[PDB]
Amino acid sequence: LQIFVKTLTGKTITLEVEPSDTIENVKAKIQDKEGIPPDQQRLIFAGKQLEDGRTLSDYNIQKESTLHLVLRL
């Protein structure tokens, strides 16, 4: 599976994700490609702010789905 994460910059980053990956696993993938501690990350999917511990499949995030990243303080 691959998904896109939109930054505040506008710049788009593809992410290789397993379908059962938790939102932490996603934040820690972004920790890798950008370098933003998961605690400063806030991810959004169709307006729903996604929660650590639930998985991509719990929120029905699928191939080529877009998450919007925004920061926390």
DSSP result, 56-73? TTTTT--TT-EEEEEE--
Side-chain half-sphere CA neighbours of 13 within 13 A: 20
Residue 64: give its domain's CATH number.
Answer: 3.10.20.90
What count of other Cβ atoms lies within 10 Å of the Cβ of residue 70? Answer: 13
- Technique that determined the structure: X-ray
List the resolution, Å.
3.3
Specify the pairing of strand 41-45 against strand 48-49: antiparallel
Tokens of 65: 């789905």
Overall number of domains in the chain: 1
Write down the residue that tokens 């788009």 correspond to.
12
What count of other Cβ atoms lies within 10 Å of the Cβ of residue 22? Answer: 17
**Alpha-carbon Rg of the chain, whole angstroms?**
11
Q: Which domain holds residue 12?
A: 1-73
